[PDB]
């Protein structure tokens, strides 16, 4: 029962691990971007695209995790335990959720092929020694 | 900010609240029936239907929650914290997953319209006072 | 001034009294069913069907009665009087409100002819000796 | 959960609030004119118009409220409580019931569009400061 | 002067004597069923069918009997005689009225041929000794 | 409870109130006239006319009530109560049966329109004051 | 001198002996059902079918036997002779008239072939050992 | 329930009483004639004629009466009542059985119309005074 | 010399042993059924069907066996010996004779295919747990 | 009742009584010739002829009787009873079974009409007084 | 090396795990049913169907296990150990053989599509908690 | 009970008795060969050949027996009975599983007629007296 979340879209887990861990933006910025730029289509009762369903499921799962964190914060009495578990969850599941949200938002707003090639380009650029590499890191743009 | 999971499939949360809390099976039975009936299509890289994506996401989320549960079980030193955490995650959080899995598996197995009509039929049956309730409750099947 | 609420729909008050009083579900279940199944159509600005208008009027009337009961319970000081008036509001008018709500909801979801015939079928079934009667009471489904 | 009775008829609750509270006639006069002009059509078993259904429901509700008032008057032993509840019902539900009856009777008698334009014109007239207000207010008539 | 009230319809008093005593519902239930199923026809000025005339005469006569029972209960003195006469008029005269009302209402609702065949098929079932008789009695419906 | 026995045939209860109570003949005379005139028609297996069904029902009901009277006379032992019961059933109840039998037999013999016209004429005769009342009363006959 | 009463009707005495002795109803019920259903045809001067002649002869014979019974009851002075004769007439001389009346009424009201097949089926039903015997027994009727 | 045995065949009971009582031959001769002249047709499984069915039924009933007489003669202990009942049956059922057997056998062998006319002819002949009457009584021949 | 009596008719001894031993009716009932239902055909001098010959042979065999039992009972002196031999004759071989008679009679009266399928149906019904089985056993009827 | 085994084959029990009791061979010789000449057709599942069914039934019955005799021999403790029953069966059933086997085997081998004519001729020969009886008795054969 | 014995036919191990243990008949009855329904096919030299093969290997292996049980019952010394091994081999090894034999015999008798749908419906029925399920289980007979 | 395992494929138990018992290799070698050569075919959802079904059944049965042996070894406490049981299950029943595995694997690899001819030739080689027996035994090979 090894189900790969990105298998049906053309990507794969270790392909998304090519990029460094510090590259991805925080969760709050991604949620704000999704709410500000895609709120009307998400809440409509329509089958828009396969990306929308995954985005809705991810947002709901994040909400449930935050609710559980709030409950353990309120009810549990041990301070060492409360901070330990909160830091653990926030630092160990946030990375994968950031990866998922960034991938889906970028695919929605830029295109699948561009996002597919950008990963390879950025990884190859990072691996090259500085002296024989272009000085400007690649970026995603629409202007 | 108020995404409703069932809106795109024709239902709502309130409509699905006709069934009582004890009606749904356990998580284990749903997982084994999902593995037994629909496993080759889940693994294949194809956009088969909107139900498959939701099922995959739900299974992954349940796996992540179970991983967190075993982490806290093996790391926490205070037994009270461990037992309270596992009781919470098993009781209060499992009902939504049971509802989601039941809905998505039944829709694949029998059809969406049949489940939609079954919901209102069961609501009508359950709202009747006990003195005039017929003994047989509605059930889902495809054979006479 | 003997207007009959059910006359224009093909029914009649004494016909709806054929069924026993305990048969009807409570008010809360009917209100939740109406909210869950027909909330989009009730609030839309259109003349959908003659049933929608009656349903809207009944809902608003029940809301006004509940508000009056709440004010009576709060502002009044006599415990016996408030208890008695609350008992009156939630027993006497409750029966007719339940009958009206059940009739309109069932007609909306199942059909007029089916609801018309079901009353006769159940009324005949109730008053037959058990030894010479089918063992399962009729029900509305699908 | 927020059904508006006038929404389906092309009106709105706050639009009807242009007229002051003292403008509406009493309940008795409305009942007598309704009986005088439209008794035969009200009793007939026909879906004549959407106004007739609303009028019938309003009349039945008023009858039920009056029966409740008679019951509390005859049963309760403390005269102060009976006086208080009678005053409350007559000074609270009266306004709404007179509004509904007046709107529905006038719509049948003269026409819905005429009533709407009359409401707009009366609002314009009443909003004017007294020093520049013409002496005669608008009225509904066919002569 | 042997006047059989059933011959003109097709039946016979001997044919209806096979039914058990408890097969029939109460007279009040039959009256309520008759009123709630067809009250406009029983009050319209039209010779609708031969069943309607018999129904009207039976209803009027039962009303007369109830008036007589009330009078004897009110005006008599010895309590014992009161109990005897009331019980007699309630049971012995009431059984025949229950039978007649059931016959006419069923003939109106289902049809004459169906009820005739139902009586014929019920007779053989009731005549069989219990040892070889299947437990389930015949059921009359559509 | 508003069923009218004579209303199918064009008559009405208050229409038959014109005739005084003493006008009607006796039960034995009506029954023996019916037996002598329409025995073969009443005993046939056919519904020739609506009057036949009513006549049959009335005759069987009268037989039932006579059986009841015999039963109470035989069984009851209290003299006063027994005589009161028998006198009541003989006198108070038999008037309506006399009316019904007279109406149906006369209709069958002569004609419904003739019966109605006779009722109207007898009403006029009974309303006329005694001073100018003809010494002979209207009668039903053909030759 | 060995005339079989059922021979001309496609049956035999031994074939009709499948049914037990207690299966048949009483004489009274048969007489009232015969009067209720077939009376105008019995009185009419027409030989409608061979069954009517046999029914008329059987009724007349039973009437003659009852007349003999009442005569011997009212004339003989010894009570023992009277009650012995009455018991004999009622018990040892009924089992044949009941059989004849049942056969002839059933043949008219349902049909001869149906009665024959019913006898054949009742034989196999009654010969089965009780352990494997189904609960309900075959019956004659026309409605479903 | 007054069923006349001869009505279907064109005669009545009163017509058969026109002849005197002593005219009819005894039962033994009629039984022997039936056995000797009609045994093959009586015992065959076929619908021959309406006379055959009546003849079979009469023969079987007479046999049943005879065995009843044998049983009462054997078992019952009082000789007086024994001979009394035997004489009673032999003297009162024998007459009607003789009439029935003679009528059916004669109709079978000679013809129905001939027997019907012969009854009237013999009755009229018997009633006439001897001096103005033919001296030879009628008889059936060939 | 392994001749099987049922082999030519489409069955075997093993198939007829599928049913339980108590199922078969007694020999007397089968003999009376055969006498009452098929006596005219059995004694006729004609070749009707292969079932008739087997039935005749079986009946004659049973008659001969009964005669032998009667002679043994009559002309023997030891009560134990006669008791044991009649017990043996009535028990051991009566079972197979009952099976043969029942099979032939049922095949004659109902048909070969129906009897063939009924054995399988009854065996499968018998060998099923009660909770998941139709409530009542099958039977042969309607003919 | 009175079933005659030979009636359906064109013969009669008293017609076959012309031959004396000593004419028939033993059971063993008949069994050996039946096995030698017709074993293959007896075992096959075919309705070859009416004679085969009768032969199979007779062989099965003889086997059952021999099994009963063996059981009586092994069981009974009194030798007198064993001797009496064995003598009775061997001297009583042997005649009938030899008659049946001889008739059926001869009919199969030679033909039914030939057997009937042989019976008639042998009866005529045996009825003649011995004074002028020809010496050679008739026999069944095919070669000149 | 996860060789699933049911995958090639269309089923799966976890699909058949829902049936309760009491649902299966005994192994002796299954063997008798297999022998009586079809013995010629199990002994003919032909590759009739994939079910016949698995039936043949299962039948041989059960006899192997029975021989093992007889040997251990005979040659062992301690009675307790004998009881343990015999009970183990009859129950825990026998359940799987009962399941496999039932599956193959039913697939031969009724078909494959019908048995697959029956398994699906039975699973749906059994997963429901008792309070809301109909009291009668599904039945497979045609 | 007369079912022959190899009879569908043309062989016979008597035919396989030519080879001595010691000829067959151990179970582990055959299982290793089957895993290394036919791993993907046994796990596929298809019945390619009748040999595959028999191979799958045999492997599952051997796994069952190994589980039984482990169970009795773990649970039983008596040393003598335990060792007797494990020795029996290892030695006595393993021979027939070895035979089945050898037959089916060889038929899958080299063909069937080749196996039958090899059986016949090995029988001929064994029947020869030792004086004239060639020193090399027959073998199954292709190159």
Short mmCIF file of C-alpha atoms in Angstrom, two decimals, chain A:
data_model
loop_
_atom_site.label_atom_id
_atom_site.label_comp_id
_atom_site.label_asym_id
_atom_site.label_seq_id
_atom_site.Cartn_x
_atom_site.Cartn_y
_atom_site.Cartn_z
CA UNK A 1 0.00 0.00 0.00
CA UNK A 2 2.77 2.42 -0.99
CA UNK A 3 0.85 5.31 -2.56
CA UNK A 4 2.91 8.17 -3.99
CA UNK A 5 1.07 11.52 -3.81
CA UNK A 6 2.87 13.02 -6.83
CA UNK A 7 2.81 9.90 -9.03
CA UNK A 8 -0.37 10.83 -10.92
CA UNK A 9 0.93 14.33 -11.76
CA UNK A 10 4.30 13.42 -13.31
CA UNK A 11 6.57 14.13 -10.32
CA UNK A 12 7.96 11.85 -7.62
CA UNK A 13 9.02 12.27 -4.01
CA UNK A 14 12.80 12.23 -4.40
CA UNK A 15 12.56 14.60 -7.38
CA UNK A 16 11.08 17.16 -4.98
CA UNK A 17 13.97 16.42 -2.59
CA UNK A 18 16.47 17.68 -5.18
CA UNK A 19 15.94 21.25 -3.96
CA UNK A 20 17.38 22.33 -0.59
CA UNK A 21 15.10 22.39 2.43
CA UNK A 22 15.46 26.15 3.04
CA UNK A 23 14.12 27.08 -0.40
CA UNK A 24 10.42 26.68 0.39
CA UNK A 25 8.43 29.62 1.80
CA UNK A 26 6.60 29.40 5.10
CA UNK A 27 3.09 28.00 5.49
CA UNK A 28 1.46 31.33 6.32
CA UNK A 29 2.56 32.99 3.07
CA UNK A 30 1.32 30.05 0.99
CA UNK A 31 -2.05 30.02 2.75
CA UNK A 32 -2.39 33.78 2.30
CA UNK A 33 -1.56 33.50 -1.41
CA UNK A 34 -4.09 30.70 -1.89
CA UNK A 35 -6.81 32.62 -0.05
CA UNK A 36 -6.16 35.94 -1.80
CA UNK A 37 -5.72 34.61 -5.34
CA UNK A 38 -7.87 31.47 -5.58
CA UNK A 39 -10.75 31.76 -3.08
CA UNK A 40 -13.62 32.09 -5.57
CA UNK A 41 -12.79 28.91 -7.50
CA UNK A 42 -12.00 26.76 -4.46
CA UNK A 43 -15.41 27.26 -2.81
CA UNK A 44 -17.45 26.76 -5.99
CA UNK A 45 -19.33 23.43 -6.32
CA UNK A 46 -17.63 22.34 -9.54
CA UNK A 47 -15.02 19.86 -10.79
CA UNK A 48 -12.46 22.43 -11.90
CA UNK A 49 -9.19 20.49 -12.09
CA UNK A 50 -7.30 17.72 -10.26
CA UNK A 51 -5.19 20.37 -8.50
CA UNK A 52 -8.20 21.95 -6.77
CA UNK A 53 -9.25 18.74 -5.01
CA UNK A 54 -5.76 18.15 -3.63
CA UNK A 55 -5.56 21.77 -2.49
CA UNK A 56 -8.88 21.50 -0.62
CA UNK A 57 -7.84 18.25 1.06
CA UNK A 58 -4.48 19.71 2.11
CA UNK A 59 -6.08 22.84 3.57
CA UNK A 60 -8.62 20.80 5.54
CA UNK A 61 -5.90 18.48 6.87
CA UNK A 62 -3.82 21.47 7.98
CA UNK A 63 -6.86 22.86 9.78
CA UNK A 64 -7.44 19.57 11.59
CA UNK A 65 -3.79 19.37 12.66
CA UNK A 66 -3.92 22.95 13.97
CA UNK A 67 -7.10 22.15 15.91
CA UNK A 68 -5.44 19.12 17.51
CA UNK A 69 -2.42 21.26 18.40
CA UNK A 70 -4.69 23.84 20.03
CA UNK A 71 -6.48 21.15 22.04
CA UNK A 72 -3.27 19.61 23.36
CA UNK A 73 -2.06 23.12 24.12
CA UNK A 74 -5.14 23.89 26.20
CA UNK A 75 -5.94 20.64 28.00
CA UNK A 76 -2.53 19.04 28.65
CA UNK A 77 -0.86 20.12 31.88
CA UNK A 78 2.84 19.30 31.39
CA UNK A 79 4.80 22.33 30.09
CA UNK A 80 7.90 20.44 28.95
CA UNK A 81 5.70 17.93 27.12
CA UNK A 82 3.46 20.58 25.55
CA UNK A 83 6.35 22.57 24.08
CA UNK A 84 8.20 19.40 23.03
CA UNK A 85 5.25 17.97 21.11
CA UNK A 86 4.30 21.34 19.57
CA UNK A 87 7.84 21.94 18.33
CA UNK A 88 8.04 18.35 17.07
CA UNK A 89 4.87 18.52 14.98
CA UNK A 90 5.56 22.04 13.68
CA UNK A 91 9.10 21.13 12.62
CA UNK A 92 8.54 17.62 11.24
CA UNK A 93 5.25 17.83 9.31
CA UNK A 94 5.51 21.45 8.21
CA UNK A 95 8.26 20.60 5.72
CA UNK A 96 6.18 18.11 3.73
CA UNK A 97 3.10 20.33 3.90
CA UNK A 98 5.14 23.30 2.64
CA UNK A 99 6.43 21.18 -0.25
CA UNK A 100 2.92 20.04 -1.17
CA UNK A 101 1.38 23.52 -1.00
CA UNK A 102 4.20 25.14 -2.96
CA UNK A 103 4.04 22.51 -5.70
CA UNK A 104 0.28 22.78 -6.14
CA UNK A 105 0.14 26.59 -6.02
CA UNK A 106 3.00 26.95 -8.51
CA UNK A 107 1.48 24.38 -10.87
CA UNK A 108 -1.86 26.19 -10.71
CA UNK A 109 -0.46 29.66 -11.38
CA UNK A 110 2.38 28.94 -13.84
CA UNK A 111 1.89 25.59 -15.60
CA UNK A 112 2.94 21.97 -15.14
CA UNK A 113 5.81 21.85 -17.64
CA UNK A 114 7.46 25.03 -16.35
CA UNK A 115 7.42 23.76 -12.76
CA UNK A 116 8.73 20.39 -13.94
CA UNK A 117 11.75 21.91 -15.71
CA UNK A 118 12.45 24.53 -13.02
CA UNK A 119 13.35 21.86 -10.45
CA UNK A 120 16.00 20.31 -12.70
CA UNK A 121 17.37 23.72 -13.70
CA UNK A 122 17.68 24.93 -10.11
CA UNK A 123 19.27 21.69 -8.90
CA UNK A 124 21.87 21.69 -11.67
CA UNK A 125 22.59 25.39 -11.06
CA UNK A 126 23.06 24.81 -7.33
CA UNK A 127 25.42 21.87 -7.84
CA UNK A 128 27.80 23.75 -10.18
CA UNK A 129 30.91 25.37 -8.66
CA UNK A 130 30.54 29.16 -8.43
CA UNK A 131 33.42 30.19 -10.71
CA UNK A 132 31.95 28.47 -13.80
CA UNK A 133 28.27 29.22 -13.16
CA UNK A 134 26.02 32.17 -14.11
CA UNK A 135 25.75 34.63 -11.21
CA UNK A 136 21.94 35.00 -11.16
CA UNK A 137 19.82 32.22 -9.68
CA UNK A 138 16.79 31.19 -11.75
CA UNK A 139 13.36 32.49 -10.75
CA UNK A 140 9.74 31.93 -11.77
CA UNK A 141 8.03 34.93 -13.35
CA UNK A 142 5.16 35.95 -15.62
CA UNK A 143 6.03 39.53 -16.64
#
